Design a protein around this motif. Structure first.
Motif, PDB file in Angstrom:
ATOM      1  N   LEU B 620      51.517  80.528   6.560  1.00 15.13           N
ATOM      2  CA  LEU B 620      52.159  79.697   7.666  1.00 15.13           C
ATOM      3  C   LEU B 620      51.546  80.238   9.094  1.00 15.13           C
ATOM      4  N   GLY B 621      51.102  81.163   9.114  1.00 12.71           N
ATOM      5  CA  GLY B 621      50.880  82.146  10.229  1.00 12.71           C
ATOM      6  C   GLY B 621      50.081  81.341  11.377  1.00 12.71           C
ATOM      7  N   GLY B 622      49.127  80.328  10.873  1.00 11.75           N
ATOM      8  CA  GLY B 622      48.446  79.395  12.033  1.00 11.75           C
ATOM      9  C   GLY B 622      49.247  78.924  13.260  1.00 11.75           C
ATOM     10  N   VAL B 658      45.379  87.095   0.898  1.00  6.13           N
ATOM     11  CA  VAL B 658      44.279  86.744   1.993  1.00  6.13           C
ATOM     12  C   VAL B 658      43.310  85.788   1.520  1.00  6.13           C
ATOM     13  N   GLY B 659      42.580  86.217   0.338  1.00  7.35           N
ATOM     14  CA  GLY B 659      41.436  85.586  -0.156  1.00  7.35           C
ATOM     15  C   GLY B 659      41.641  84.011  -0.554  1.00  7.35           C
ATOM     16  N   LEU B 660      42.775  83.780  -1.010  1.00  2.83           N
ATOM     17  CA  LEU B 660      43.114  82.356  -1.577  1.00  2.83           C
ATOM     18  C   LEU B 660      44.231  81.591  -0.594  1.00  2.83           C
ATOM     19  N   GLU B 661      45.103  82.412  -0.053  1.00  8.28           N
ATOM     20  CA  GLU B 661      46.082  81.776   0.611  1.00  8.28           C
ATOM     21  C   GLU B 661      46.399  81.893   2.185  1.00  8.28           C
ATOM     22  N   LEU B 662      45.495  82.612   2.874  1.00 12.01           N
ATOM     23  CA  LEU B 662      45.667  82.644   4.344  1.00 12.01           C
ATOM     24  C   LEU B 662      45.492  81.212   5.094  1.00 12.01           C
ATOM     25  N   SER B 663      46.121  80.844   6.025  1.00 15.65           N
ATOM     26  CA  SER B 663      45.953  79.706   6.822  1.00 15.65           C
ATOM     27  C   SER B 663      44.542  79.797   7.272  1.00 15.65           C
ATOM     28  N   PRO B 664      43.810  78.462   7.131  1.00 17.13           N
ATOM     29  CA  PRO B 664      42.474  78.218   7.807  1.00 17.13           C
ATOM     30  C   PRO B 664      42.501  78.617   9.081  1.00 17.13           C
ATOM     31  N   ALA B 665      43.468  78.019  10.028  1.00 17.35           N
ATOM     32  CA  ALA B 665      43.717  78.493  11.260  1.00 17.35           C
ATOM     33  C   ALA B 665      43.670  79.995  11.641  1.00 17.35           C
ATOM     34  N   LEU B 666      43.729  80.817  10.872  1.00 16.47           N
ATOM     35  CA  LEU B 666      43.648  82.347  11.203  1.00 16.47           C
ATOM     36  C   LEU B 666      42.314  82.975  10.672  1.00 16.47           C
ATOM     37  N   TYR B 667      41.489  82.171   9.900  1.00 16.58           N
ATOM     38  CA  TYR B 667      39.933  82.675   9.626  1.00 16.58           C
ATOM     39  C   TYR B 667      39.539  83.351  10.894  1.00 16.58           C
ATOM     40  N   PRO B 668      39.448  82.605  12.094  1.00 14.54           N
ATOM     41  CA  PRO B 668      38.700  83.056  13.200  1.00 14.54           C
ATOM     42  C   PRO B 668      39.196  84.473  13.785  1.00 14.54           C
TER      43      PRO B 668
END
Lengths: 673, 1082
Positions: B620-622, B658-668
């Motif tokens: 959700l974090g994004g 982190v590797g499969l489930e993290l929000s795309p908007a957090l990758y940066p």
């Protein structure tokens, strides 16, 4: 002594360099003193085989001119002269096999010179072929001989290749002169396999050759296409690839950019994994690697596919070359083999003849359906089945050709029905192809526009009716009582078929028939009525468009119950049982008929299942049955001739086949003069 | 075959019994089908059930028996005799806390059975009565349960009276009690028939039995036992009651004794207690209707003074019967006593009101009580307050409160009708819902609140009141849920359904909607699968609410939740990533979950809840884009969690989440934080600070690999936003200084596998200096290209990564010198790949895979770097390995049709010779490409294509091509011949021979070059002649053949030839003399 001493002299003259002087003397004496040649070349090879590699290079150089004279001795046809030239050629061949590091040298100079010399080439080829015959395919003697055969051609391509291909065609014909059940077993198999080997090597040089040959090469492909050990299959794929490439570049031809583009795209298409499976190649990256058993027990549908692709290649070319006879020659060659009795080749030929032909006659159709009948007699007594499949595919391709007013279009619908009745997986696939193409054909002929399919096909039955009664009573489906449900009974087995392609074909046939039955009324295609209902019930597990008289009730119910009995898909079962729950409440007095069919599976689903959606209908049916627990037992279907309906439409010969033999023979005797 | 399938349903139902979700649904669906089958083939189904019941009889046992008996009762109640009587009835007799449920179920079965069967059950009873005349009473107890009508009651009494004196005293007692219930059974089921009795054969039986039962009553205890039946038998005699209100004297003396026993004048407590029971039963009887009312009026005041005395409490069901009867007689003095008083009276009142609602046309409806609603509300609030602030007194307030909530469930309308009042009531119920120490009360409070939320109820609380109150409830419940949660959440679903229904007919609202949103998101990570599914279902109603409101941001993703353990959590996280839009709710849900997760993390350093919370935060974090920055720093600290009992699990789950489930908007943010962390692993001289850092690096590599493997839609957009270059450089630099141990080799291997995936994704990622980055990456990985099995897997992986790195990569060293440095760097990589393929020249397949990959590495290196590569690449074309040659020639094919002639033409022609088939096809395609690219004029035209299976003996074709070319393309001659003669030295004897044949035409062209005045071209011809001489000397086997082809053709320059012979001679000299013989022939 003259040839012996002259060999000793020229050999020892090199033993240091004077090699071009020796060759000049050799040329001079070869021109001047020709009788020496017989002795000289015999003595050359004797000295050559004993000598060092350096002496062997020298030896071939001085041999080179002499070869020309070898024709002189041959014109006479008395044994001794012809025999010693034949021995000289066998010795030169032996020499070629032995000296693996002289190998391009021997081929370029000795075999390139021999390649010039037309007369001798029949003796040379019989020497090559007999050398190959020493062990057949897999013998290094044959393998090197094929690679060498290109050298023979390189001088006078058209005659050499004409004799190789000619021997192949003639030997394939010779198989029919003394038949065997299976081609790989045949008394002449090695002779064919050897020539196929040569044909691959030649085929790249056939980039010079193809224009006279192209039909004959496809005739060879047709018999060989997936046969034998996997290396021969790879070879035969390569043979076609190389021929298409040769058609894109022969300097004698002038094909258009469209025709050339068609060939370029054909090379691409033949390079695809689809075509590898067609040629009985599986489990390989590259056909070439293997070219230089796990028979896929050959599927005629694969040959059909190849043959239409080769036909599109030939047709494209024939537009550009108006002066050719290629398709007519292929038609004759295929026709000859299709009609003549040879169990191994005849099926393949029939398939091809059908695919390629541009016209047909009722006398040819008579021969095909007579072949179908005789093949079914042989089933009373695997090869027969493949012949049946072939004849049915042939009928499929041939029936669009037939004249617009011919009875035979209508007759072939019953040929298809009889074929489906056989219960053999590939026969049913073929019969449904025949039936699919037949209904397209009859609709293209407008025939349905003023009549039901029922009236049209049953008219052709009326003379046959005496025979048809005996068929229907042994099948346990009776078209006289209800045509649409009997035809649907046959089609329902198509849903079992192991191949999703044949199921989808079966669905197209049902859709076609549904449309046609309503077409003569001028109704909408989904209007339920005493004729459309059978198709609609058949279509019920397969069509989203569909989903969105006590004899007729019994037939309808029995079809739905039949579809429940077999289908493994629980989603099919949901749809079907929902319709049975309503149908039980709707037709309660007739519903007992189906109970025997349902009993086994309903016990199974009650005791096992845990899907409420499927169970809700099942419990509804049991409730409905008990609530209305008879006026029609399961025997009721037997009275009008339908006890077989659930019989036949189960999972995938003698008694049925003999009746079909009588029926087809009566069909021919009535319809064909 | 119908019987056989009915038996199959019966058999299915038996096997699905508990004693032997989908099995629940299947069981109920089977039971319902058996009932509907029994509606027709009744005896088949009942026989089967009976047979099963016998088998079962001979927690799961009780549940199975309950299922069978409930099925039997519903079948019998659906009935349209022999085995009912001979088979079922004895088994139902056998049954007659789960024992009481089974007795109730069996009694309901027997009641249903008896309706149509009565004569048989009565024959059993009559037979045991007869046996008792000549002691086991249990069949007599069946009189309690059986259905009875007026005619049947008369028969039972007549049969009893006749036999009663001949029965034994214990049997007489069992009969007396059982007939008392049997009378009630009739009156309750058939109130019309009892009414008709007050509008002579029944009375004769009842009087006869009364006098018999009176004669039995020789003692205080027997009197106390019989008085409840004697009053019933007297109630069955209306004309006797009329006479004794003025043969009957014992009936008068009985009523007088009851009056005396109620008035306290009878000394015997047992007789007073019994008289209460009797006079309540009289009062009760009157409600089902007369002279009986005069009898009630004579006793009711003393009965009220006995049961409702606050100064001397009686010693609840009896008191309830009294109060309900008094209300029905006259709908309130004793009522006010119960409103004021002992808690037992509050209990009796509330339960009496509940019975009044839940149980005739003249009976007063509950609505007369709607004067007392304020007092009932006060009683509820007081009881609630006393239950919550709370041993025996406390336990009694709980039972009272449960009863009041059951009363509210039975009717809200009462409370609301006499009246803030509603808000207080709802708030009190809401306060119970959370209470863990009272699950039964909480459950009923939920049901009560649900019925309070039905349309008719809300109207009585309208819209401005609904909004304020219902939102206040929602807000409070949600606030507790974010601090039996599953059942509360199911109930909250049904409340939302009610709210949607109420609005469809139509600041705390925003707060409530927000807290609801918070609660629902927080349920998505809950360790209970059922809770998660319910929360998903709740989003549907949140959407429906918004549709209803708007019709007058997340909505698409909410409808996708509505459409839906580890697999479910994966699906949830995938949906959570699709939430783009921030809301107060999702933000707060993240912050709260983060706070809880940090607390749980500390406690850990319950695990599955922490894993799910972690996953939720990651997904959700994004929306929150600081707190998120701190959470990410904490995740990164947990990748190296050293904890002995849970560390592996923590590291694994952080890595996977982190590797499969993290929000795309957090990758940066993740890449900047990984970068910044990994950058701390270097000192100010750029040297590596080497267990924690190594573990971080391994987990980082796996995390980044997993991220880059992931194909979540929209992920490409975000992968572009932050550079990976400095991070990846720092990763490889770190991993380079790890030694050559097994674990370090696995890390090097994994980093290669990451680099491969990273290059595939390179089209998605962003680069400041991509070309430099890839160059430096090849430079590093090429060092690895050298336990033996693992090092060979490292070679394979490294090479596969290098093949990915080299794919359109121009080389860049760190202008004219730069092109030469680029060429020198090319030569280093290229030589290393050549060495690796020479070393190649399951263990077999791995080597072949390494070889194929190495060839592709060369290929890609060449495909980009053409100006640096082509010359060295011709050295590949010569190379001893045919497979590598063929592939390299396909690479040349790519360059030459994209945008040299002599060198490539030789490598084509010479390879067409080969024993390898693939090499021949490849060469043939290269010849075609050269022909097209250099427009080389050719007879017997040439066609490019795959899979063209060319023969091995093609010398006459190669030769024909060569001399046609030798005529057509003379400029090639110098370039071509020198390269051919070099290839001669490389070749086998077969390929050497072939070289001579195709060389032979070219020789003739050499005159053109010495007719040309260029000193360099004259020198190159001279050098070709020197190399022809060198070959002529070396290649002795060929030597007579070389002389014939080469030296004869050359004999057709000849100063230069003779000087080259002489200078080379100055075996060399002998060979030149012997070769001069050939030369002279020309």
């Amino acid at each position: 002594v003259p040839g012996t001493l002259l060999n000793i002299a020229l050999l020892n003259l090199g033993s240091a360099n004077n090699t071009l002087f020796i060759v000049s003397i050799s040329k001079t004496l070869a021109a001047n003193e020709p009788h020496l040649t017989l002795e000289f070349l015999e003595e050359c090879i004797s000295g050559f085989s004993k000598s060092s590699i350096e002496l062997k290079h020298l030896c071939l150089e001085y041999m080179t001119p002499w070869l020309s004279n070898l024709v002189r001795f041959c014109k006479h046809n008395d044994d001794a002269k012809r025999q010693r030239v034949t021995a000289i050629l066998d010795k030169l061949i032996t020499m070629t096999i032995n000296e693996k590091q002289m190998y391009p040298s021997i081929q370029a100079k000795i075999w390139g010179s021999l390649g010039q010399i037309t007369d001798l080439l029949d003796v040379v080829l019989d020497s090559f072929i007999k050398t190959s015959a020493t062990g057949g395919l897999g013998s290094i003697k044959a393998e090197v001989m094929a690679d060498t055969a290109v050298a023979l051609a390189s001088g006078n391509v058209k005659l050499v290749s004409s004799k190789v291909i000619g021997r192949m065609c003639k030997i394939i014909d010779k198989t029919c002169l003394s038949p065997t059940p299976t081609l790989e077993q045949h008394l002449m198999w090695d002779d064919i396999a050897i020539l196929a080997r040569y044909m691959l090597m030649l085929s790249f040089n056939n980039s010079l050759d193809v224009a006279a040959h192209l039909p004959y090469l496809f005739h060879v492909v047709t018999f060989l296409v997936a046969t034998g050990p996997l290396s021969l299959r790879a070879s035969t794929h390569g043979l076609v690839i190389n021929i298409i490439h040769s058609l894109c570049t022969c300097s004698q031809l002038h094909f258009s950019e469209e025709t050339k583009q068609v060939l370029r795209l054909s090379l691409t298409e033949f390079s695809l994994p689809k075509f590898y499976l067609l040629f009985g190649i599986s489990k390989v990256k590259s056909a070439a690697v293997i070219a230089f058993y796990e028979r896929e027990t050959f599927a005629l549908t694969s040959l059909e596919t190849v043959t239409e692709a080769l036909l599109e290649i030939m047709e494209a070319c024939m537009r550009d070359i108006p002066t050719c006879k290629w398709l007519d020659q292929w038609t004759e060659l295929a026709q000859r083999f299709a009609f003549q009795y040879n169990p191994s080749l005849q099926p393949r030929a029939l398939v091809v003849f059908g695919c390629i032909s541009k016209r047909v006659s009722h006398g040819q159709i008579k021969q095909i359906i007579r072949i179908l009948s005789k093949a079914l007699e042989s089933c009373l007594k695997y090869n027969s089945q493949v012949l049946i499949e072939a004849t049915v595919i042939a009928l499929t391709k041939l029936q669009p050709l037939l004249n617009k007013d011919s009875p035979l279009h209508k007759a072939l619908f019953w040929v298809a029905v009889a074929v489906l009745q056989l219960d053999e997986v590939n026969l049913y696939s073929a019969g449904t192809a025949l039936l699919e193409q037949n209904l397209h054909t009859l609709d293209s002929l407008r025939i349905f526009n003023d009549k039901s399919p029922e009236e049209v096909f049953m008219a052709i039955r009326n003379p046959l009716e005496w025979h048809c009664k005996q068929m229907d009573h042994f099948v346990g489906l009776n078209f006289n009582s209800n045509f649409n449900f009997a035809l649907v009974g046959h089609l329902l087995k198509g849903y079992r078929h192991p191949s999703p392609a044949i199921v989808a074909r079966t669905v197209r046939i049902l859709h076609t028939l549904l449309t046609l039955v309503n077409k003569h009324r001028n109704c909408d295609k989904f209007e339920v009525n005493t004729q459309s209902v059978a198709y609609l019930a058949a279509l019920l597990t397969v069509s989203e468009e569909v989903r969105s008289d006590p004899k007729i009730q019994a037939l309808l119910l029995t079809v739905l119950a039949t579809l429940v009995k077999y289908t493994t898909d629980e989603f099919d079962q949901r749809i079907l049982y929902e319709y049975l729950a309503e149908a039980s409440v709707v037709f309660p007095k007739v519903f007992p008929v189906v109970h025997n069919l349902l009993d086994s599976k309903i016990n199974t689903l009650l005791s096992l299942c845990q899907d409420p959606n499927l169970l809700n209908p099942i419990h509804g049916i049991v409730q409905s049955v008990v609530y209305h627990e008879p006026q029609y037992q399961t025997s009721y279907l037997q009275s009008f001739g339908f006890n077989g309906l659930w019989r036949f439409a189960g999972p995938f010969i003698p008694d049925y086949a003999e009746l079909i033999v009588k029926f087809l023979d009566a069909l021919i005797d009535t319809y064909l003069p």
